[PDB]
Design an enzyme around this catalytic site. Structure first.
Site, short mmCIF file in Angstrom:
data_model
loop_
_atom_site.label_atom_id
_atom_site.label_comp_id
_atom_site.label_asym_id
_atom_site.label_seq_id
_atom_site.Cartn_x
_atom_site.Cartn_y
_atom_site.Cartn_z
N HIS A 69 6.55 54.45 36.58
CA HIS A 69 7.42 53.97 35.54
C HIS A 69 6.59 54.16 34.26
O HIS A 69 5.37 54.31 34.32
CB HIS A 69 7.71 52.49 35.66
CG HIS A 69 8.63 52.13 36.76
ND1 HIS A 69 9.94 52.56 36.81
CD2 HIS A 69 8.45 51.33 37.86
CE1 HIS A 69 10.51 52.07 37.90
NE2 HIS A 69 9.63 51.32 38.55
N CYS A 95 9.48 57.01 32.87
CA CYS A 95 10.38 56.65 31.74
C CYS A 95 9.65 56.72 30.36
O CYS A 95 8.41 56.59 30.27
CB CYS A 95 11.03 55.28 31.95
SG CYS A 95 11.69 55.26 33.55
#
Lengths: 159, 98
Positions: free
Chosen positions: A104, A147
């Protein structure tokens, strides 16, 4: 998965204008995937993260790289182990390098399984001309699956 | 009078999504980006240099959309990008020589 090989003619007609890329192995590669989180913050289990991880390992092998792997690392472990990977003496004798990071993330940075952030500028730096004399003038490839925000894109309909 | 280098050069970085956005991942198939990357690369590393292969990846990613009916988050999108300080073509010359 297989990778189609290039013709000797192809190699003869292009090598003079390309980075030298003939050593064996073609370079080291690091595939680092964070899938299970701690979750001393926020972060969801990355279902699907093992396919990505497996797919890259396979690709970079078929492409001729000596592949190192790491999984579920804290921000500080990523940093230390990335540094150790950048300092490996095998780089003196290879033509290129590849690093993949899958976690992430936010804009400019990736998460360790502990929910702490590793700055991508710090990552690139470990491999730059000052810190990594062995890879000087050698191509270094990075691939960053992470992300860079949390907004999903609604997209737009074409005129 | 030696040639010297900038502190940083000769890197190329592929990113799965754009600044401010999250990245599409399939629980069953992994990320859109990793998947496009492996097929473009396995097929074209023989005749196309890496920055051009990252353009073909961009082309695949641009055309894909999310199938998650229910959650408005169906027909959703992502865009990939690469950034480069390369100074020459990067051809990986797979399987050469034997």
């Amino acid at each position: 998965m297989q990778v189609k090989p290039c013709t000797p003619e192809f190699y003869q007609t292009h090598f003079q204008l390309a980075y030298r890329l003939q050593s064996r192995p073609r370079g080291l590669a690091l595939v680092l995937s964070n899938v299970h989180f701690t979750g001393e913050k926020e972060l969801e289990f990355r279902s699907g993260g093992d396919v990505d991880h497996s797919t890259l390992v396979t690709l970079f092998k078929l492409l001729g790289y000596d592949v190192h792997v790491l999984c579920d690392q804290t921000a500080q472990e990523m940093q230390e182990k990335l540094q150790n990977f950048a300092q490996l003496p095998a780089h003196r004798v290879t033509d290129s390098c590849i690093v993949a990071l899958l976690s992430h993330g936010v804009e400019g940075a990736i998460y360790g399984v502990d929910g702490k952030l590793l700055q991508l500028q710090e990552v690139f730096q470990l491999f730059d001309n000052a810190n990594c004399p062995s890879l000087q003038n050698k191509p270094k490839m990075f691939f960053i699956q992470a992300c860079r925000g949390d907004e999903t894109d609604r997209g737009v309909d074409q005129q | 009078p030696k040639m010297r280098l900038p502190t940083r050069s000769d890197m190329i970085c592929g990113y799965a999504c754009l600044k401010g956005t999250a990245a599409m991942r399939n629980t069953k198939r992994g990320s859109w980006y990793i998947e496009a990357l492996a097929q473009v690369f396995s097929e074209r590393a023989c005749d196309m240099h890496v920055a051009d292969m990252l353009v073909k990846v961009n082309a695949l990613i641009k055309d894909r959309e999310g199938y998650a009916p229910g959650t408005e988050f169906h027909r959703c999108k992502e865009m990939s990008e690469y950034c480069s300080t390369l100074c020459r073509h990067l051809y990986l010359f797979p399987g050469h020589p034997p």
